[PDB]
Amino acid sequence: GSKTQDLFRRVRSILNKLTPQMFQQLMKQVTQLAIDTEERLKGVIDLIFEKAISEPNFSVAYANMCRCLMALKVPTTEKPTVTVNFRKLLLNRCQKEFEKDKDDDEVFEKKQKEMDEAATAEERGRLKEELEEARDIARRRSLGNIKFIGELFKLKMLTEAIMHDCVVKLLKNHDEESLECLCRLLTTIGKDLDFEKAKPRMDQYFNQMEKIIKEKKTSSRIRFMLQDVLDLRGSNWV
RNA sequence: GGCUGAAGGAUGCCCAGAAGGUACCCCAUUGUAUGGGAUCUGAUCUGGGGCCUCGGUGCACAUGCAUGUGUAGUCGAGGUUAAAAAACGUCUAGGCC
Ligand SMILES: [Mg+2]
Ligand SMILES: [Mg+2]
Ligand SMILES: [Mg+2]
Numbered sequence: 001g002s003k004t005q006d007l008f009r010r011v012r013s014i015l016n017k018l019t020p021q022m023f024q025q026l027m028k029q030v031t032q033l034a035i036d037t038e039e040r041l042k043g044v045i046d047l048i049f050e051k052a053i054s055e056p057n058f059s060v061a062y063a064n065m066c067r068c069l070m071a072l073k074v075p076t077t078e079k080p081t082v083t084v085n086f087r088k089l090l091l092n093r094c095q096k097e098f099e100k101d102k103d104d105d106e107v108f109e110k111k112q113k114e115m116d117e118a119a120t121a122e123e124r125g126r127l128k129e130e131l132e133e134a135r136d137i138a139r140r141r142s143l144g145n146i147k148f149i150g151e152l153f154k155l156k157m158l159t160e161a162i163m164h165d166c167v168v169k170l171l172k173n174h175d176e177e178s179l180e181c182l183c184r185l186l187t188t189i190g191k192d193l194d195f196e197k198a199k200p201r202m203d204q205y206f207n208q209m210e211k212i213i214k215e216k217k218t219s220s221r222i223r224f225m226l227q228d229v230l231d232l233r234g235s236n237w238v
Numbered sequence: 239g240g241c242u243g244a245a246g247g248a249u250g251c252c253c254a255g256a257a258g259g260u261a262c263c264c265c266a267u268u269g270u271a272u273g274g275g276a277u278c279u280g281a282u283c284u285g286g287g288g289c290c291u292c293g294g295u296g297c298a299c300a301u302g303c304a305u306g307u308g309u310a311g312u313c314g315a316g317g318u319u320a321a322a323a324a325a326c327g328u329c330u331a332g333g334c335c
Contacts, residue, residue, distance in 0.1 A: 035327080081330070082249090168259085168261050171261075
């Protein structure tokens with residue numbers, strides 16, 4: 001049983017040491033890891049996903065690390081005649097994280113009543129600090145998940161269609177968190193998405209947020225980041 | 239009681255179909271929302287796909303270095319079916335001790 005925990009230790013060590021420049025030298029270590037059980041694979045994917053969405057800066061490296069294990073079949077423990085590819089498991093974690101928003105507010109609502117139940121000023125302030133801290137923890141996760149999906153797109157483990165139905169989903173929910181994520185995703189995938197096969201559809205995305213830019217109904221910071229994204233588009237994504 | 243491995247399943251690729259999505263467009267309510275349609279898709283499921291024909295090279299054989307024959311998971315060259323695939327970070331049926 002110590003073998004699974006030792007594999008987790010080595011995977012976490014590699015993730016901590018992983019950096020863009022020294023990438024290649026650690027990849028041999030990644031290919032030499034004995035991942036042969038659905039539990040080990042799920043745990044390694046859990047570690048990679050958590051690190052990649054909790055720390056967006058180095059997510060690029062982690063994305064490329066995932067490319068080195070795009071083909072790592074393992075037999076499902078329940079029915080040992082079935083197999084699960086690493087890609088199927090890593091993408092399921094990504095898609096599940098992407099659509100938690102539908103339920104996300106719910107848990108805050110489940111805590112929102114407590115805001116009323118904290119009678120005294122000390123309790124009210126402590127409850128308010130905890131709820132906004134939770135809101136920060138969630139918005140930091142969603143942004144990490146979006147940048148990780150965008151980084152996996154540049155390595156072709158995804159396709160243009162998932163980005164085109166992720167951008168439109170973020171944009172249809174005109175709430176602040178979604179528009180911040182839309183800014184991050186377009187900023188990280190604009191050059192690899194601005195092609196002539198997607199020229200018509202893209203020509204509406206920005207146009208839509210242009211109205212947002214002109215409406216000034218949302219918070220300023222959102223407009224500010226949208227202006228940055230539109231200006232980066234105007235300069236050929238560089 | 240231990241070693242090994244079938245293009246038999248599974249995985250990957252390709253094709254068909256389905257759930258789902260679909261900014262823009264159109265139709266209805268009509269409210270910029272919902273529902274339906276049209277493309278475009280399809281992170282997900284259900285199936286199907288391991289064809290021919292000809293050369294080069296290599297190999298083996300059989301005849302007199304040459305010719306004929308068969309073909310190496312061979313390189314190409316073309317056809318055919320909607321589809322001509324990772325000889326596969328996998329499980330088995332076995333096979334051996
Ligand atoms: Mg449909
Ligand atoms: Mg199939
Ligand atoms: Mg089949």
